[PDB]
Amino acid sequence: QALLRILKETEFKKIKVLGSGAFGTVYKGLWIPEGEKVKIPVAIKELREATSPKANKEILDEAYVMASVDNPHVCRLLGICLTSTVQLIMQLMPFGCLLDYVREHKDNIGSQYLLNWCVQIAKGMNYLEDRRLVHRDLAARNVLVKTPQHVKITDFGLAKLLGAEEKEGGKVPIKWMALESILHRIYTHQSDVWSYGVTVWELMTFGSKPYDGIPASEISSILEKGERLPQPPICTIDVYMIMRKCWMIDADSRPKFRELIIEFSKMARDPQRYLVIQGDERMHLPSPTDSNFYRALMDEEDM
Ligand SMILES: *CCC(=O)N1CCC(Oc2cc3c(Nc4ccc(Cl)c(Cl)c4F)ncnc3cc2OC)CC1
């Protein structure tokens, strides 16, 4: 596959740490092409080492699959460096993750932005369903902001790495997983619909923590009793019904990503009807002037 470039230690450098996580540490890096004088900004993930002791042939086979995604709202793995640590290289998203963006601008986000982010995240998830790829870690933290009008889903496939009976605040995302994933470790595209519902809840609450103050070891207990995340103040009932249907105990009764795209697109064409934000009348998508300016500088891809 020509979609995964193998890099040398000597052709990239980590210059600043951006953050850590369950999979690894993220560095802003500079890619130095051979024989050139330029320095190209990249993103670098130095992964942990929980990979069930066995790989190299497995580490590369998954990277070939992670580097083959071709969708405007799914991040594509660009390179890999197999040293003492497996270092992954991708395009830099200077705006960061959607969770931190929504927290920092929680009083500057309109319903048109919120509804469009859900459509885009659903479009990105629907791609992986057709490519038969389960994310297993969909969350607002793993949604990157390319531009405020264009978000992308990242940290895919990195499931073949962690694990460990730490599912009993931790590493595995208990409060984002479906019930069958917690009890039986069943990961399907319908369990990703559950994670999508929690990710929508995170966006509508402007970055609030789900089940705040509840031990992760007790989440499966409160779910079996029927408790779910509460209705955010800005959500009409039509939007909250969608979130509740993603969290049904029967995975086959949860909506499909193809259905979530259509419904959220319908709500985006009349955003003030379905989301109630105090004064949501001044927060508008950028004009054709600014969008052309953003795309010419930061977002030249198709959509
Ligand atoms: C939501 C909070 C959070 O989880 N973090 C804070 C901001 C993040 O910093 C940035 C990360 C990236 C990434 N991450 C990434 C994901 C998967 C893989 Cl394989 C690779 Cl190589 C990655 F680099 N990707 C692209 N751009 C950014 C930009 C960031 O800040 C500007 C990290 C943790």
> What is the C-alpha to C-alpha distance for residues 108 and 130, in angstroms, rounded to an integer?
35
Q: Does residue 303 belong to any structural domain of this protein?
A: no
How many whole angstroms from 26 Cα to the centroid of ligand 1? 6
Instruction: Indicate the number of domains in the chain.
Output: 2
Nearest residue CA, atom 32 of ligand 1?
19
Give the three-class secondary structure for 36: coil
For residue 222, CA distances in Å to 99, 135, 167, 179, 217 come to 25, 25, 16, 10, 10
Angle formed by the axes of helices 189-204 and 111-130, to 10°? 170
CB-CB neighbours of 177 under 10 Å: 27
Please indicate, yes or no, whether residues 206 and 84 belong to a single structural domain of this protein.
Answer: no
Which segments within the chain are labelled E, that is strand? 5-6, 12-19, 24-31, 40-47, 79-82, 86-90, 143-147, 150-153
| The residue type at 146 | K
Give the experimental resolution in Å: 3.2
For residue 41, give the CATH number of its domain. Answer: 3.30.200.20
Are 137 and 285 contained in the same domain? yes
Taking a C-beta distance cutoff of 8 angstroms, is the pair 244, 98 a contact?
A: no
Protein residue closest via CA to atom 3 of ligand 1? 141
Do both 144 and 282 map to the same domain?
A: yes
- Domain identity same for 193 and 87: no
Residues having CB closer than 6 A to ligand 1 are 18-19, 21, 26, 43-45, 77, 88-90, 92-94, 96-97, 99-100, 141, 144, 154-155
- Experimental technique behind these coordinates: X-ray
User: Is residue 46 domain-shared with residue 121, that is, in the same domain?
Assistant: no
Q: Are 218 and 252 members of one domain?
A: yes
Is 146 found in the same domain as 61? Answer: no
Domain that includes residue 210, residue range: 96-296
Examine the domain organization and report whether 63 and 104 are in the same domain: no
With respect to residue 301, please indicate whether it lies within any of the assigned structural domains.
Answer: no
**Domain check: are 83 and 102 in the same one?**
no
Same-domain pairing of 153 and 250: yes
**Residue 166 falls within a domain, yes or no?**
yes
Give the atom of ligand 1 at the shortest distance from the alpha carbon of 155. Answer: 17
Residues carrying an active site annotation? 137
Residues in the chain: 303
Backbone φ and ψ of 157, nearest 5°? 75, -15
Query: The tokens of 228 are what?
Result: 């779910």
